[PDB]
Design an enzyme around this catalytic site. Sequence first.
Site, PDB file in Angstrom:
ATOM      1  N   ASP A  73       0.825  -1.202   0.000  1.00 18.41           N
ATOM      2  CA  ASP A  73       0.000   0.000   0.000  1.00 18.41           C
ATOM      3  C   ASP A  73       0.867   1.262   0.000  1.00 18.41           C
ATOM      4  OD1 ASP A  73      -1.921   1.895   0.312  1.00 18.41           O
ATOM      5  OD2 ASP A  73      -2.388   1.410   2.408  1.00 18.41           O
ATOM      6  N   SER A  91      -0.782  15.735 -11.874  1.00 21.96           N
ATOM      7  CA  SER A  91      -1.034  15.367 -13.251  1.00 21.96           C
ATOM      8  C   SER A  91      -1.284  16.626 -14.060  1.00 21.96           C
ATOM      9  CB  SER A  91      -2.246  14.438 -13.330  1.00 21.96           C
ATOM     10  OG  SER A  91      -2.661  14.219 -14.663  1.00 21.96           O
TER      11      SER A  91
END
EC number: 3.4.23.22
Length: 330
Positions: free
Chosen positions: A35, A199
């Site tokens: 994770d 992004s």
Amino acid sequence: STGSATTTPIDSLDDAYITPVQIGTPAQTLNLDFDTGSSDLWVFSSETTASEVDGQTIYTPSKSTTAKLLSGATWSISYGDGSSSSGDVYTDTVSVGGLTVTGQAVESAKKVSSSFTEDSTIDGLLGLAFSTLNTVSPTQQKTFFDNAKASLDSPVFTADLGYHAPGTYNFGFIDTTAYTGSITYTAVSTKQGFWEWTSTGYAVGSGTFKSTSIDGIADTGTTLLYLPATVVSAYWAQVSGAKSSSSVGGYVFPCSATLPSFTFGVGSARIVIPGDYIDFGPISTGSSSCFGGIQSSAGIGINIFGDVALKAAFVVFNGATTPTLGFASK
């Protein structure tokens, strides 16, 4: 040193991925959920409340000659999906794919929430976010990656998750045969303890690319792609019959649909998520309403590039002094 381990979807939807991990001496192999959105290595154990164990493999520190109680240390964690676990701590030897760390904090669960009990395939979590998020008190502990780092050939790990197929976690090297083209690297902020990056935009299907900054985290422990409501609405507007259902808990779409791809930007590069990756199947067995793999982050407080996005790429988690993230197509 290096390590290389195969990671395998737990089910037909790629809800999560499990990677075998060797703990203790002699080795006890547990299948852990790696994770990158948390920083605790915790396991089902001989200390876990019996009624909360249902099929998981447990770590038994009393059977490990290298286990030592970390006296006074406790831990307690709550995840974004509302699940939780807590317990005490041992140090022991931990190996992933041939890479060994001695003195790793292995957090033994005394209690786990229902979601963990109900998932017999996950024996615990191995956190790969920054050690500043580790929950051990009163002495915070380091992640497996943090402990391994100095011994690694290069201070990196990579995630290469499969779509309905196994993939690979590598530590200490970049497998140049595992991706196509070049890797585009992008800046990381560690301010919140995550692999947080920005992004450069998105496109829906064959549509034009929208240049827009989307801050979010690369999180292998989250199944879906969670993005701003504007972006998600633009995606689902291209699917006839798709709607957001408060009763179901997100966007659903007719199982008869063909889903468009979704592209996200990494610098000037583009990662394309095929439409099939966005299909999470019937909302309930036999339903003709299907659950979407792109969902709104509104009310999470953060955008999450979960498995839906990450499995479309070869992803480099560069833990050099100034960390960065790399994405390549594959």
